[PDB]
Amino acid sequence: EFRPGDKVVLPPYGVGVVAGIAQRSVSGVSRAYYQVDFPGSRSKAYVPVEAPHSVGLRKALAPEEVPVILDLLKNGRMPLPKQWAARHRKTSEILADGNPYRIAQMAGQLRAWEVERGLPDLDRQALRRAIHLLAEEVAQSLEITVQEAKRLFEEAWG
DNA sequence: GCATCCGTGAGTCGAGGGTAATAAGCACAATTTAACACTTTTGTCAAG
């Protein structure tokens, strides 16, 4: 599944590149792990080889899957709760799962709100969280620095 | 009344020394304060 040098993202923390298989002592007999690394923050990670795909360790969008996300930004939207509580809740949830399409979509309707009616000091924080994570994986897939990715996102709008 | 508890005290002046760090949020109504426009007062000036 995950090979030594597979470049994949391990949400929520952000993008990074894995490293390899290890035996870390946990409970009983040592189970194989993916040592997974990250770019900026210096910390290691160990992801169970049992079910790494269902645990939230997923792949990275191909260089060809960018336009669908940029389009999920420019024109993209989604329904949001009325009460500010539940709204914040859902924003946090999508900012948890790590699903790139979902996060792009959320950022889409949220951003659509910031430029029209207005945005609170909460929903906007989460919005910027989304835009930043987007910048991370669009930087990782397209092999460009965060500047050009955030400039793709600023290309969507202006 | 006989052991066992709360209660109150206990030295003078000084010299310095010192400085510091927890906690939810968002829309909106109600005022407060800052801004601005302009009338009046008052102090100054040219010159009786």
**Nearest nucleotide by C1' position to the A87 CA atom:** B26
Q: Is the CB of A79 under 7 A from strand B?
A: no
d(CA A94, CA A123): 12
> What is the resolution of the experimental data for this entry, in Å?
4.3
Query: CB of A120 under 7 A from strand B?
Result: yes
Place of tokens 């919005």: A127
Please state, in angstroms and rounded to a whole number, the distance separating the CA atoms of residues A30 and A24.
6
Helices (H), A115-145: 123-141
Q: Within 7 A of a protein CB, which nucleotides of strand B?
A: 25-27
Question: For A109 and B21, how far is CA from C1' in angstroms?
Answer: 40
Q: How far apart are CA A102 and CA A94, in angstroms?
A: 7
C-alpha distances out from residue A111 to A54, A96, A131, Å: 30, 19, 9
CA within 13 Å, CB half, A71: 5
Q: Is the CB of A121 under 7 A from strand B?
A: yes
Tell me the DSSP string of A35-80.
Answer: EE--SSS----EEESSSTTTTT------TTSHHHHHHHHHT-----
